[PDB]
Amino acid sequence: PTKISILGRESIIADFGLWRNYVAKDLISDCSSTTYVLVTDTNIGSIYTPSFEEAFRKRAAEITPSPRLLIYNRPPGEVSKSRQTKADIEDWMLSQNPPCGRDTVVIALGGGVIGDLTGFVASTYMRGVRYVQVPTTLLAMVDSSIGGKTAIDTPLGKNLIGAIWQPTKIYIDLEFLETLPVREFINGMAEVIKTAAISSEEEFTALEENAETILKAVRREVTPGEHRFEGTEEILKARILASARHKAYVVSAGGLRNLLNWGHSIGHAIEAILTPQILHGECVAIGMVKEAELARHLGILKGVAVSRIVKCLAAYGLPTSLKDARIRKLTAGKHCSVDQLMFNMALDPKKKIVLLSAIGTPYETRASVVANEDIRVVLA
Amino acid sequence: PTKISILGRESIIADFGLWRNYVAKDLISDCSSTTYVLVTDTNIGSIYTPSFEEAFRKRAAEITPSPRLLIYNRPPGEVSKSRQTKADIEDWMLSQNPPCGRDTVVIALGGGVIGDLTGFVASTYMRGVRYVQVPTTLLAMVDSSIGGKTAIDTPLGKNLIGAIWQPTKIYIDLEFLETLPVREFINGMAEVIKTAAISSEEEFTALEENAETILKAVRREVTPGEHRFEGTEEILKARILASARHKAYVVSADGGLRNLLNWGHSIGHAIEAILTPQILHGECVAIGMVKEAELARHLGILKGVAVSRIVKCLAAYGLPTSLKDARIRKLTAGKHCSVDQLMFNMALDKGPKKKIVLLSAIGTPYETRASVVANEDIRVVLA
Numbered sequence: 037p038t039k040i041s042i043l044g045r046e047s048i049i050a051d052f053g054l055w056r057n058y059v060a061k062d063l064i065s066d067c068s069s070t071t072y073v074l075v076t077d078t079n080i081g082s083i084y085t086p087s088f089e090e091a092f093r094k095r096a097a098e099i100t101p102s103p104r105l106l107i108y109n110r111p112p113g114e115v116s117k118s119r120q121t122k123a124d125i126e127d128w129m130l131s132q133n134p135p136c137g138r139d140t141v142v143i144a145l146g147g148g149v150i151g152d153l154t155g156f157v158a159s160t161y162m163r164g165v166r167y168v169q170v171p172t173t174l175l176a177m178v179d180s181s182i183g184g185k186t187a188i189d190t191p192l193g194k195n196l197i198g199a200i201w202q203p204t205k206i207y208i209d210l211e212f213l214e215t216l217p218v219r220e221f222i223n224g225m226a227e228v229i230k231t232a233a234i235s236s237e238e239e240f241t242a243l244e245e246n247a248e249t250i251l252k253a254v255r256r257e258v259t260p261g262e263h264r265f266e267g268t269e270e271i272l273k274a275r276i277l278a279s280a281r282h283k284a285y286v287v288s289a290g291g292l293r294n295l296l297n298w299g300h301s302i303g304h305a306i307e308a309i310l311t312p313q314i315l316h317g318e319c320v321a322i323g324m325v326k327e328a329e330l331a332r333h334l335g336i337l338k339g340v341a342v343s344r345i346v347k348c349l350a351a352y353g354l355p356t357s358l359k360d361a362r363i364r365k366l367t368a369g370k371h372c373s374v375d376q377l378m379f380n381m382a383l384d385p386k387k388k389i390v391l392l393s394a395i396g397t398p399y400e401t402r403a404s405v406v407a408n409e410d411i412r413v414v415l416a
Numbered sequence: 417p418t419k420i421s422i423l424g425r426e427s428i429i430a431d432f433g434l435w436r437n438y439v440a441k442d443l444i445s446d447c448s449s450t451t452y453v454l455v456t457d458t459n460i461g462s463i464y465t466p467s468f469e470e471a472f473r474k475r476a477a478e479i480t481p482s483p484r485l486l487i488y489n490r491p492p493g494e495v496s497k498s499r500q501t502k503a504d505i506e507d508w509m510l511s512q513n514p515p516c517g518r519d520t521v522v523i524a525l526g527g528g529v530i531g532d533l534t535g536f537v538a539s540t541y542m543r544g545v546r547y548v549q550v551p552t553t554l555l556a557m558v559d560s561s562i563g564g565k566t567a568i569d570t571p572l573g574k575n576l577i578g579a580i581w582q583p584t585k586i587y588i589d590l591e592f593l594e595t596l597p598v599r600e601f602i603n604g605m606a607e608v609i610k611t612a613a614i615s616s617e618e619e620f621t622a623l624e625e626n627a628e629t630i631l632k633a634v635r636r637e638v639t640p641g642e643h644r645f646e647g648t649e650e651i652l653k654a655r656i657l658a659s660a661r662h663k664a665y666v667v668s669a670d671g672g673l674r675n676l677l678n679w680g681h682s683i684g685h686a687i688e689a690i691l692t693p694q695i696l697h698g699e700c701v702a703i704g705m706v707k708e709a710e711l712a713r714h715l716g717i718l719k720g721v722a723v724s725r726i727v728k729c730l731a732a733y734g735l736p737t738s739l740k741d742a743r744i745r746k747l748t749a750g751k752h753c754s755v756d757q758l759m760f761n762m763a764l765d766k767g768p769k770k771k772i773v774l775l776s777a778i779g780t781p782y783e784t785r786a787s788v789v790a791n792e793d794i795r796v797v798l799a
């Protein structure tokens with residue numbers, strides 16, 4: 037297994053089959069406790085909780101008295117990232133017999149949604165209890181689960197109420213990617229490509245090479261009794277952990293974290309308009325394409341560089357323009373006026389944007405100051 | 417202005433009239449921001465918010481842009497220390513124009529209730545924003561506001577959901593004690609006496625001396641224009657800050673030192689679980705100290721003379737020393753506390769023995785932590 041230290045500690049454990057042969061075991065020995073609370077939605081749970089309850093029983097049998105495994109399932113969707121669901125899980129935990137104590141270890145089994153909710157639930161339960169991250173979406177494995185940022189949503193916006201509570205462990209089991217819907221896998225790929233583009237040319241080239249292969253496995257129908265990523269196993273692990281590693285690196289450090297926002301400046305503006313029909317990664321993809329175009333316009337990025345960005349994103353199934361087909365269909369031709377975008381970008385004179393002087397090489401070691409008029413030029 | 421440092425840094429500012437001449441000023445200069453949110457109940461607010469709005473305007477006038485002061489008032493009582501109340505305070509914060517942001521400085525103006533709620537609201541607002549403590553109750557000045565422990569209550573218990581969020585500043589304005597109801601003042605005195613009893617025989621001795629005087633000012637009519645603690649001003653500040661200082665000390669100490677802060681609380685908590693909400697926390701802890709002291713004596717660790725002074729000193733301040741005290745009896749229609757019930761409530765605290773803070777003498781703890789004691793030995797003092 038591959039370990040990626042984060043914040044001066046071992047937190048991340050990444051490899052195939054962790055949820056089957058490792059997690060349970062490791063939790064009982066490194067996260068000693070009498071109460072383990074697994075949280076997940078009905079989609080990912082029905083697929084993975086059974087194998088775990090069993091794997092759990094085997095490890096708990098050897099310990100006495102036997103540690104209990106409590107499970108909580110919530111409806112899928114970001115509808116659970118609410119004040120209501122959090123209170124529930126809390127009252128449910130307090131209603132257990134005996135009530136779940138401060139020794140509780142919470143297991144966040146899911147994506148960004150389950151992740152933020154559970155992480156925040158843990159941070160405040162009796163003023164905080166330990167918890168581990170078990171990212172099931174690609175976007176969660178390389179980004180959302182690394183960092184400790186947790187929160188829920190309110191009818192006035194996303195992530196408005198939450199906390200920064202570092203998970204004790206972060207289990208990255210690449211096998212979760214075997215059942216992850218194709219669209220979701222592609223969505224996460226945006227951040228992976230983003231990470232490379234702001235840190236390593238060689239890594240961005242690896243992504244360029246592997247694209248065809250990865251996408252073949254991600255789409256090919258897999259007959260029961262086989263692994264979706266049969267021969268590409270090592271390639272996938274390398275490309276995905278590279279991103280996770282970077283996120284972990286940045287999180288362990290000032291202006292280095294701003295770079296994690298490349299493509300997000302414009303990206304966020306687009307999403308504010310096209311969500312929830314269009315996904316985060318899908319919007320960031322178009323965001324990277326434009327911010328790259330902005331870098332070119334400002335004379336900081338070369339034409340050749342800009343093309344590969346687009347080419348590489350497309351190669352993975354990500355949208356590169358607001359004019360894309362799918363997007364236009366999924367959003368019945370919604371339109372992002374150059375103004376509404378500049379309005380949104382401000383909801384966050386001049387704008388701060390991450391510019392690239394070349395693939396793998398950031399212009400400044402932080403978000404560069406850019407003038408509005410210069411931004412408005414790449415928004416059409 | 418006397419300053420006490422907590423957790424390796426200044427935070428506590430203690431003196432008279434801070435709410436009138438200091439707070440506002442200091443907030444604008446040391447807690448620079450565009451949004452300040454004052455939270456309080458309708459009891460303490462109606463008495464103190466007006467003078468503050470004004471004091472605020474004066475300081476904000478010089479600085480430009482103008483730092484806005486938003487105010488939130490909730491019904492008094494621990495009924496506001498709820499998920500709902502917290503949620504409103506937040507939606508209200510997000511609904512302002514423009515919405516309260518991460519630069520926000522929250523002002524917790526009130527007692528333990530307002531303190532815990534606001535402190536917790538702050539800890540999670542956009543994943544955390546700065547906040548200051550402005551303890552208006554005695555119990556809050558020397559205990560609840562020092563430490564960073566925040567939370568709300570749920571129908572299944574107190575302080576079940578919350579967080580540990582250290583306040584940026586802790587303004588201890590002794591003038592709040594001029595309007596604090598007599599009962600509340602006496603309530604807080606329990607913890608002050610507790611602090612002394614576990615750290616300084618001298619400090620305890622002074623408490624015994626200053627009693628008769630303090631209680632005179634607390635229980636007297638103050639004609640218009642006169643400060644309630646006219647001549648005793650320095651005495652009060654000394655006695656009160658001594659406790660606050662200790663709390664600050666323990667809280668900054670890098671284990672069992674925090675256990676000592678639980679003296680009288682072992683039995684004390686058991687009693688409160690039964691007699692609350694009619695009887696207050698301090699009032700229950702008082703009886704708790706009396707009994708735990710009796711337990712120490714029984715176990716041969718505390719002398720008879722020592723135990724007496726404890727009782728005498730608590731009484732001297734108007735605190736109950738036994739469950740048979742008439743004031744209690746009245747407030748609880750004579751509710752009974754079975755030893756069985758008390759021993760059970762003491763177990764709800766996560767066997768054959770209970771851990772209790774024992775004193776070998778006033779100011780001197782037996783062990784540097786909660787000593788292990790057998791059930792039968794505890795049951796004897798309760799009978």
Ligand SMILES: Nc1ncnc2c1ncn2[C@@H]1O[C@H](COP(=O)(O)OP(=O)(O)O)[C@@H](O)[C@H]1O
Binds near residue numbers: 216
């Ligand atoms: N490994 C997986 N296999 C199957 N379904 C999954 C997996 N991961 C999550 N899902 C489902 O996919 C959708 C997207 O997960 P979500 O947590 O919303 O994504 P993100 O982390 O991008 O916010 C949800 O409907 C969820 O139940």
Ligand SMILES: Nc1ncnc2c1ncn2[C@@H]1O[C@H](COP(=O)(O)OP(=O)(O)O)[C@@H](O)[C@H]1O
Binds near residue numbers: 595
């Ligand atoms: N400085 C003060 N003077 C007058 N009223 C106050 C003051 N402090 C708080 N109060 C009121 O006194 C009561 C006790 O405050 P609370 O915070 O509930 O107590 P504690 O801190 O002991 O838990 C409340 O009804 C409150 O509105």
Ligand SMILES: [Cl-]
Binds near residue numbers: 160540
């Ligand atoms: Cl909360």
Ligand SMILES: [Zn+2]
Binds near residue numbers: 320
């Ligand atoms: Zn992102």
Ligand SMILES: [Zn+2]
Binds near residue numbers: 607
């Ligand atoms: Zn107490």
